[PDB]
Amino acid sequence: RFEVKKWNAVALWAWDIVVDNCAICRNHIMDLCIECQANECTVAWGVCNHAFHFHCISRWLKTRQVCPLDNREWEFQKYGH
Amino acid sequence: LDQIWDDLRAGIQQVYTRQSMAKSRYMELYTHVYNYCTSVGLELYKRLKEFLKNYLTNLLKDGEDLMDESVLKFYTQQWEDYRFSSKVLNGICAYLNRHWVRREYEIYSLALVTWRDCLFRPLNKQVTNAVLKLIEKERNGETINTRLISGVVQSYVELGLNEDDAFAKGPTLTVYKESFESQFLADTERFYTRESTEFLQQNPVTEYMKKAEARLLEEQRRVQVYLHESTQDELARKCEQVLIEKHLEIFHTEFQNLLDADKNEDLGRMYNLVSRIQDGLGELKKLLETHIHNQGLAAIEKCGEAALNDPKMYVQTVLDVHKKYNALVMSAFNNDAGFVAALDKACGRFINNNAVTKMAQSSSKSPELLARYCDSLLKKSSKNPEEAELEDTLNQVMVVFKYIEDKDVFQKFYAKMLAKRLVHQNSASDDAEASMISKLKQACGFEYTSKLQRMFQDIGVSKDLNEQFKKHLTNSEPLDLDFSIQVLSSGSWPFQQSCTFALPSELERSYQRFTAFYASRHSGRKLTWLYQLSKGELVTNCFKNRYTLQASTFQMAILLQYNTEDAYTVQQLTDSTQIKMDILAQVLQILLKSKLLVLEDENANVDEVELKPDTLIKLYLGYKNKKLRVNINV
Amino acid sequence: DYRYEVLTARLLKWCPAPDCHHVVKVQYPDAKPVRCKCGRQFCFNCGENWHDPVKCKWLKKWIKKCDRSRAALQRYLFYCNRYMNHMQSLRFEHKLYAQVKQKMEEMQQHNMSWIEVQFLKKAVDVLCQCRATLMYTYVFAFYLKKNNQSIIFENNQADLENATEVLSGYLERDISQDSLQDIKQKVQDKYRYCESRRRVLLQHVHEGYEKDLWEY
Ligand SMILES: [Zn+2]
Ligand SMILES: [Zn+2]
Ligand SMILES: [Zn+2]
Ligand SMILES: [Zn+2]
Ligand SMILES: [Zn+2]
Numbered sequence: 001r002f003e004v005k006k007w008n009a010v011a012l013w014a015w016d017i018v019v020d021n022c023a024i025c026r027n028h029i030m031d032l033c034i035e036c037q038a039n040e041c042t043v044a045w046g047v048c049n050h051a052f053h054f055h056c057i058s059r060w061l062k063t064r065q066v067c068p069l070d071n072r073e074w075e076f077q078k079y080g081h
Numbered sequence: 082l083d084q085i086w087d088d089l090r091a092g093i094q095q096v097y098t099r100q101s102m103a104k105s106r107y108m109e110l111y112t113h114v115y116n117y118c119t120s121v122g123l124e125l126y127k128r129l130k131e132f133l134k135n136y137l138t139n140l141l142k143d144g145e146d147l148m149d150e151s152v153l154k155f156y157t158q159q160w161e162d163y164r165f166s167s168k169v170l171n172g173i174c175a176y177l178n179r180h181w182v183r184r185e186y187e188i189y190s191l192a193l194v195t196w197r198d199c200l201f202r203p204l205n206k207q208v209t210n211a212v213l214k215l216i217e218k219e220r221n222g223e224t225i226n227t228r229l230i231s232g233v234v235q236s237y238v239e240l241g242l243n244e245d246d247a248f249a250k251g252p253t254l255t256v257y258k259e260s261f262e263s264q265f266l267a268d269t270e271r272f273y274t275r276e277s278t279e280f281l282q283q284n285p286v287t288e289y290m291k292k293a294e295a296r297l298l299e300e301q302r303r304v305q306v307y308l309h310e311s312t313q314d315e316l317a318r319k320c321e322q323v324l325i326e327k328h329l330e331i332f333h334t335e336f337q338n339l340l341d342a343d344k345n346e347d348l349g350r351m352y353n354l355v356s357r358i359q360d361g362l363g364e365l366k367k368l369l370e371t372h373i374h375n376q377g378l379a380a381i382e383k384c385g386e387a388a389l390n391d392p393k394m395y396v397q398t399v400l401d402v403h404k405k406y407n408a409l410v411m412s413a414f415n416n417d418a419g420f421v422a423a424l425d426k427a428c429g430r431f432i433n434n435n436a437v438t439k440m441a442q443s444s445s446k447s448p449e450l451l452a453r454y455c456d457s458l459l460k461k462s463s464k465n466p467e468e469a470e471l472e473d474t475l476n477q478v479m480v481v482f483k484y485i486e487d488k489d490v491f492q493k494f495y496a497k498m499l500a501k502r503l504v505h506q507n508s509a510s511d512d513a514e515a516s517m518i519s520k521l522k523q524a525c526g527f528e529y530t531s532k533l534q535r536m537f538q539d540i541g542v543s544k545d546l547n548e549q550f551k552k553h554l555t556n557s558e559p560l561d562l563d564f565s566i567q568v569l570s571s572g573s574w575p576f577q578q579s580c581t582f583a584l585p586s587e588l589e590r591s592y593q594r595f596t597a598f599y600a601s602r603h604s605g606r607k608l609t610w611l612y613q614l615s616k617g618e619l620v621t622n623c624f625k626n627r628y629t630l631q632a633s634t635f636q637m638a639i640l641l642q643y644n645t646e647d648a649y650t651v652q653q654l655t656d657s658t659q660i661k662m663d664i665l666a667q668v669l670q671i672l673l674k675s676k677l678l679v680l681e682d683e684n685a686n687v688d689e690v691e692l693k694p695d696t697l698i699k700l701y702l703g704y705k706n707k708k709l710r711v712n713i714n715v
Numbered sequence: 716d717y718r719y720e721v722l723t724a725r726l727l728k729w730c731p732a733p734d735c736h737h738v739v740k741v742q743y744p745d746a747k748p749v750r751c752k753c754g755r756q757f758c759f760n761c762g763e764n765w766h767d768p769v770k771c772k773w774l775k776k777w778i779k780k781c782d783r784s785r786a787a788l789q790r791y792l793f794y795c796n797r798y799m800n801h802m803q804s805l806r807f808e809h810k811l812y813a814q815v816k817q818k819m820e821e822m823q824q825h826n827m828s829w830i831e832v833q834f835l836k837k838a839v840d841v842l843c844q845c846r847a848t849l850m851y852t853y854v855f856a857f858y859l860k861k862n863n864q865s866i867i868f869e870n871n872q873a874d875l876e877n878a879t880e881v882l883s884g885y886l887e888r889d890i891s892q893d894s895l896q897d898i899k900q901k902v903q904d905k906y907r908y909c910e911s912r913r914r915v916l917l918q919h920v921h922e923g924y925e926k927d928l929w930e931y
Pocket of ligand 4: 730731732735736737751752753754755
């Protein structure tokens, strides 16, 4: 009838992102960035729903204030933890 | 003068043919010599020179033409007496050396010069020839009365002329070099050239090897009792050129024939002998490399077909060959850098390409076999391994690893096997796993072992988080089951997306509660549950004897689909579980192979007959197993 | 899967080697790299050495004036400076090989083993390959109108350039003596990073070609 006593499932952690390249360092989104790799590196978001490493978009905005896939202004919308 | 010359001549004749006179005689002689030189003694110098020459001629009147064994007993005794007497005479007429040879020849040097002229007479060749004939008892016979040779050698060395050459400096061994050392060296060369070949023509070369070492030791010893010190290096070079450095061909042939045997005691002898000369080890290193290469290759040729499916035997054979020849290299050849390099090159060559790789038609079969050996060695087996033994065996695996060159194939295989071994909760010792990863990282860098470190820390963090879920569950009435989960990363583990499953209604409460709990502690994260590898427990509160099943989640879905009825088909099951066709075929085949589910037929070969979508599946209510807690899995 | 054949004396070509006497025959030309088995390779279409990211026509236009008022001269000076620097370094790689090898014997005789000079050889090979790719990636970068997808490329290749300079700096001096357990680790961690980065650059270039993303 019931026949259930215990269950042990296996699930994968993954960021909630439609595409996976970070489009700045071209690494995999889950991997380390170009800075943390040549030696906390989290994923930031934006209003236009694009995803980049934190330490990539940081320098990109330090130079120019445009989201680098869409010629529009950029401001943070959701940090990643 | 004249009234002084006769008495002084008497005194000088007294001092020679020594009779140990008293102080009065020598003091009065000195008084005479001082009396003359005050009133500038050139005529006295002339008289002394003429007297010395006349006495030397008188002495030569006897003792010349004896030619053997007696010109030594003559010459050494005459030389000792003459040298002592002349030193005393230099004592007597010592006012000449201070105020007439300061405005120019000291008397002792004059006596040495006159005796040198006593050397440049037939005495020179006879004495040296007899000395060489005496040393020609190198063969045997303790007849070399060393006082009959050291005296002659010291005479030659002392006779190095210094009559205002520059001034008294030190050992002027010109006469020694140009009158005795040359003949001695030439005769040594001739004697050794003859006897070495005479011996080598009759006996195996091992005995010649022993004899050559003995002769070198002997000739080093001889220069410490007979000759002068500044002949050791030159005599050593001549003996090294004659005994060895002129038979390298037979040494190389014997070296090969020794390596084909196992004599590890005289290989050390040959290393010593050949290393004594300049760059004679050139052929030895190459020959050793070739031999050890062929030995290892033909050694793992013996396993043949049995090795290709047993990692243990293959890695054991490689380790055995390496161990034996490293043991030989570290004892005989004194850990010489060249021989160690030869061993390393040959080990690389015969590990990489050999009978097993040839049979498998690729050179990436050895790293796979090593990785499978390490797998089979770290799994949780029946025996409980001892820590020291396990650590030692991992250390040996590291050597055989360091000899391979495509260290990437090994990483892929090790990552796959470690993934399986960690997911299925089936591992021997976390300490062993951590140590193995640590030494891989130490031998190949941080970039090599990043995925493995993440794969490890991820299971650690999963174990952490499951306890926190248990803690939080004390306030939310855990419905009916134990929920243990392992949340892995996504870029590290070698696992695919999913297999299109539909969750049964018996698990949805726990699924939703845990996904909501995970969404709480993290900002944005997507758990992509994969059911293709996840097991549990069933209790079967439906049968007669209260069994217990232990199978994957697919069995759970299919079995729980029978909570309503027992008359479902392949299509009817497919509708409610949404599983792929061939996967469902495999799982139903496994179920029917087990005694739980049977077809319409009673004793058919259901394990082989394929099933069609319009085929009923009947729940076998009479199921019974001998033991409890039946494990239905592959 | 590119089937080509090498033989002796629109689908056949002569070998630009100084005195090689062979013919290269291929199934169909795609400006792919072919090896003449005489020790030289070149792309079958144009005739110069193998150039992976940059197309042949731009190589022609760059090599015609290989050596426009005020700023174009500055851009040309910068790009040609980098290109000639890499070419001058590459022409002397025989000296680099001999230097590292003689270092290998020198360091091995001072009480040190063989596997160490082995990893040194591997590092040198990777360094030379990375320089050879940077060579032509600069050429590709020059004929490119600035937009969003060009800043990213010019920013990645600068980092790869810096890493290569770091690698080459490590070798010469910091292989000095008796510090293997760290110098080795640093060299390995550096050349793996360099190789991965150059693979990323080549992938970016070819994907841009496929997706029609650049502007000239
Ligand atoms: Zn980072
Ligand atoms: Zn990034
Ligand atoms: Zn955007
Ligand atoms: Zn050619
Ligand atoms: Zn071309």
